[PDB]
Structure formats: structure tokens, C-alpha cells
Amino acid sequence: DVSFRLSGADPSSYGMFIKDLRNALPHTEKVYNIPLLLPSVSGAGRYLLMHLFNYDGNTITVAVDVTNVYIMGYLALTTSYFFNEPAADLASQYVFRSARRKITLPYSGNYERLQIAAGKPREKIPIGLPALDTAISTLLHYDSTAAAGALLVLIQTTAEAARFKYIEQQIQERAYRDEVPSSATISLENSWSGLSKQIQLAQGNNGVFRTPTVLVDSKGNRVQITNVTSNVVTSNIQLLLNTKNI
Numbered sequence: 001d002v003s004f005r006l007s008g009a010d011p012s013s014y015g016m017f018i019k020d021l022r023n024a025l026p027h028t029e030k031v032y033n034i035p036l037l038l039p040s041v042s043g044a045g046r047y048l049l050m051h052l053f054n055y056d057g058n059t060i061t062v063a064v065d066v067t068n069v070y071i072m073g074y075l076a077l078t079t080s081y082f083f084n085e086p087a088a089d090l091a092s093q094y095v096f097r098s099a100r101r102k103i104t105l106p107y108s109g110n111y112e113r114l115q116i117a118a119g120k121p122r123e124k125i126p127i128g129l130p131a132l133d134t135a136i137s138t139l140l141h142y143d144s145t146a147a148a149g150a151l152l153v154l155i156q157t158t159a160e161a162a163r164f165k166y167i168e169q170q171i172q173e174r175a176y177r178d179e180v181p182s183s184a185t186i187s188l189e190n191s192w193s194g195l196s197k198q199i200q201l202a203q204g205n206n207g208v209f210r211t212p213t214v215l216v217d218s219k220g221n222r223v224q225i226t227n228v229t230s231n232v233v234t235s236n237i238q239l240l241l242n243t244k245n246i
């Protein structure tokens with residue numbers, strides 16, 4: 001399991017949690033020095049448990065699929081909650097079985113559906129460590145519209161930070177003041193599967209992407225990523241989604 005406490009949190013302690021999260025995801029090889037997530041994992045070993053604690057010390061446990069860093073569902077006191085999607089229903093066969101009741105949320109976990117449920121796109125939702133405190137608090141008691149927004153915060157400040165060093169650093173900058181994600185943040189989140197794929201295809205193609213990936217940069221300008229020498233590949237991305245799952 002991995003844990004993170006908001007009470008006393010600072011950029012250092014958040015970076016320790018993101019490191020723990022990355023290190024809890026199994027891999028058998030690296031591709032261009034980046035851990036390659038596994039094609040498949042059977043049974044309960046598929047799911048990582050993240051223990052998150054708000055400022056007041058209340059807690060949820062979040063179940064994460066280790067093949068793709070997707071959040072499946074979470075436990076809050078004696079109730080489990082899962083996305084309305086087949087991978088999450090499968091997860092509910094293995095995790096949080098001792099909950100008194102299981103609620104299926106009235107959406108799946110992709111950004112498009114969550115944003116519809118929340119009533120707003122994530123361009124307009126501030127993120128940060130204070131926002132993660134708020135999200136944990138919201139998830140403690142069911143409210144499906146509030147939960148969608150909380151879950152957009154939670155996914156960005158855990159999974160997306162684990163995937164991209166730039167996103168981890170953006171959350172660090174928001175340790176004590178929330179701010180809506182930079183355009184580059186959104187770009188990276190949206191490009192993870194594409195990038196993971198192109199990096200794996202570049203092996204066999206001299207480091208060259210078969211199809212270039214369009215991104216927005218740290219300055220807000222629209223760059224084109226064509227090969228493994230790019231900083232996105234050498235410095236930024238930390239985990240690859242296996243092409244077997246693309």
C-alpha cells in the first residue's frame with residue numbers, strides 16, 4: 001500500500017508519496033529507461049491501495065489498477081464506491097469486500113464523463129494539495145455530483161502526477177494555494193496513452209515516433225514530439241501504458 005497525509009504536508013512529503021506510488025507499480029522492463037507497465041495482472045494483485053488522509057485525519061482508501069494507474073473505486077468508512085465500468089466492477093470482486101454496502105457511482109471514470117457529471121471541465125477546476133484535502137472530505141459522504149469534481153481532483157493529483165514529473169511539480173507549486181491546471185498539464189494527461197504507444201513503437205524505428213504527438217508546452221506554446229530525444233521522453237514521462245492495453 002502507499003499513504004499520503006495532508007496534515008503537515010509540504011512539497012517534499014507530496015514528492016515522497018508520488019515516488020512511493022510510482023514504485024508500487026510493477027514492471028519487468030524499461031523502454032528508453034521508463035518503466036513499462038505490465039500487460040496484465042491476475043487477481044487481487046492488480047490493485048494498489050492508496051491511503052489518503054485529510055487535514056483532520058479522516059481517510060479514504062483508493063484502489064488503483066497497476067497496469068494503467070486507473071482509479072477503480074474507493075472505501076470511505078464502511079461504504080465502497082466504484083465507477084460504473086467493467087474494469088471497476090471486476091475490481092469490486094477483489095477490494096473492499098468487507099464494506100457494509102457497495103455503491104456504484106452513476107458515471108465511469110474517464111474525463112469526458114466525469115466532467116459532464118461535475119458540470120464543468122477540468123480547465124476550470126482548481127487543483128493542489130488544498131483541493132485534495134477538499135476532495136477526500138467530499139468523498140467521505142456520498143454526493144455523486146460533488147464526488148465527480150472531487151474525483152477529477154484526486155485523479156490529477158495522484159495518477160497523473162505519478163505519470164508525469166511536470167504534473168508532480170505543478171502540484172508541488174500548489175501545496176498551499178490551488179490553481180486550475182496549466183494548459184500543458186491538460187495536454188499531457190490527454191496524451192499519455194499516445195505517448196506511451198509512440199515510445200514503445202520507437203523501439204524498432206530508431207527512436208522515431210511512427211506518428212508525432214502534438215502537445216502544449218510549459219510556456220503555453222503548441223510543440224510537436226517526434227522522437228525519444230524530446231524532453232517529454234527523457235525527463236518528464238515516468239510510466240508507460242503497455243501497447244497491449246492500447
Ligand SMILES: *[C@@H]1O[C@H](CO)[C@@H](O)[C@H](O)[C@H]1NC(C)=O
Pocket residue numbers: 226227229230231
Ligand atoms: C528529434 O527531436 C529533437 C528534440 O525535440 C528535435 O530537435 C529534432 O528536430 C528531432 N529529430 C529528428 C531526427 O526527428
Ligand SMILES: O=c1cc[nH]c(=O)[nH]1
Pocket residue numbers: 069070071072083108109110111155159
Ligand atoms: O479513464 C479512466 C477510467 C477509470 N479511472 C481512471 O482513473 N481513468
